[PDB]
Design a protein around this ligand. Structure first.
Ligand SMILES: *[C@@H]1O[C@H](CO)[C@@H](O[C@@H]2O[C@H](CO)[C@@H](O[C@@H]3O[C@H](CO[C@H]4O[C@H](CO[C@H]5O[C@H](CO)[C@@H](O)[C@H](O)[C@@H]5O)[C@@H](O)[C@H](O)[C@@H]4O)[C@@H](O)[C@H](O)[C@@H]3O)[C@H](O)[C@H]2NC(C)=O)[C@H](O)[C@H]1NC(C)=O
Ligand SMILES: *[C@@H]1O[C@H](CO)[C@@H](O)[C@H](O)[C@H]1NC(C)=O
Lengths: 49, 146, 49, 77
């Protein structure tokens, strides 16, 4: 993906459910606020521990 | 909201393992369905006027899974989850060569130790190849958009 | 940060650990953190210094 | 099943075990009143209401897994 480098605080979340690997970030949705919105979903083959 | 399919080599011979409350070797060690969402299983056959899909060598599957620990006295099974693969699949190859194949791998002490061992068996092809499709539907994962 | 993921953990021959059998997931920031590359593929070492 | 770009020599640079400068903590906890580190709901949105929800959640005021990347040795340039 592409991302703009900034000075403001950012957050990332990673999880795995039955519909795949789920990556959440606030940059794509909320630059000056913050929330874990689904910006990526890998259709993964397996669950990673 | 979204749909999910899986497909696999399912002949009709073990079709009696299609039930929701099934606890057979395909249910125990291979896959278990989604109990919170509707599902459907379709067993189809290769048409004569269709060469778009290929035919594999033989039906192969697993029928046993055991985590023997380094003490060589404590053994624990595994429970497969919905749309999930056990660590049983991480050691078993993509196919099983013949019936009763033993696949084993050393385990680290933090994950249990000893040797993870699994047993695989097989079912040969019929006159025409049969495919198994499993569809699961979900309402609350994304936008209603399909 | 970069993240390597798998359900498999093994020790190396020298006594160290960190070996991940089969396919393994890697997420990598690139271009001073501008690229978000990721692969669940097979990784291989080599026996150099 | 795809391509992969191979760039340079297989002569890896020396790697050290020198965590003495690494291990120095920072008191940086989270807050639930300020709502730090909560996943947004994945299938529904709401407005000016209170919503019970079930999900994959952290604890509060967690120690964390605080690390930082350490630059290598560089004498001059
Ligand atoms: C989002 O959700 C929040 C909470 O769920 C909403 O906040 C409340 O919204 C309701 C709905 O409008 C408000 O209820 C209103 O109350 C009015 C009362 O009128 C009388 O009081 C007025 C002054 O209000 C103050 O004093 C009263 C009595 O002491 C208190 O109850 C109030 O909270 C205030 O402190 C006078 O000017 C007036 O002349 C009357 O004497 C009533 O007339 C309305 O019809 C309505 O029922 C409630 O007050 C809000 N609470 C707050 C602001 O603390 C919020 O609005 C929502 N936002 C949206 C929907 O956009
Ligand atoms: C990311 O960078 C490339 C090249 O710099 C650019 O073409 C692309 O538009 C950027 N992404 C977005 C979403 O604009």
């Amino acid at each position: 993906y592409n991302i703009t480098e900034d000075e403001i605080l950012e957050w990332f979340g990673i999880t795995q459910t039955a519909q795949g690997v789920h990556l959440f970030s606030s940059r794509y949705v909320d630059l000056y606020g913050g929330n874990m919105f689904q910006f990526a979903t890998l259709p993964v083959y397996d669950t990673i521990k | 909201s979204s749909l999910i399919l899986d497909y696999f080599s399912y002949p009709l011979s073990m079709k009696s393992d299609l039930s929701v409350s099934s606890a057979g070797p395909i249910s125990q060690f291979n896959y278990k369905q989604s109990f919170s969402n509707p599902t459907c299983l379709i067993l189809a056959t290769v048409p004569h006027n269709l060469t778009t899909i290929t035919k594999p060598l033989k039906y192969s599957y697993i029928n046993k899974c055991s985590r023997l620990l380094s003490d060589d006295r404590t053994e624990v099974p595994q429970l497969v989850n919905a749309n999930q693969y056990s660590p049983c699949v991480s050691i078993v190859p993509s196919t099983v060569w013949e019936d009763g194949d033993y696949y084993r791998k050393q385990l680290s002490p933090l994950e249990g130790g000893g040797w993870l061992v699994a047993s695989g068996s097989t079912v040969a092809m019929t006159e025409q190849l049969q495919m198994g499709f499993g569809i699961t539907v979900q309402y609350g994962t994304d936008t209603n958009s399909v | 940060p970069a993240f390597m993921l798998g359900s498999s953990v093994g020790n190396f021959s020298d006594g160290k650990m960190g070996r991940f059998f089969n396919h393994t997931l890697v997420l990598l920031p690139d271009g001073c953190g501008t690229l978000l590359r990721a692969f669940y593929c097979i990784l291989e070492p080599r026996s150099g210094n | 099943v795809d391509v992969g770009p191979d760039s340079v020599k297989s002569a890896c640079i020396e790697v050290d075990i020198q965590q003495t400068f690494f291990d120095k903590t920072w008191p940086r906890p989270i807050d639930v009143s300020k709502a730090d580190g909560i996943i947004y709901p994945q299938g529904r949105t709401y407005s000016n209401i209170t919503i019970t929800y079930q999900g994959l959640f952290p604890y509060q005021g967690d120690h964390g897994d605080m690390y930082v990347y350490s630059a290598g040795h560089a004498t001059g340039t």
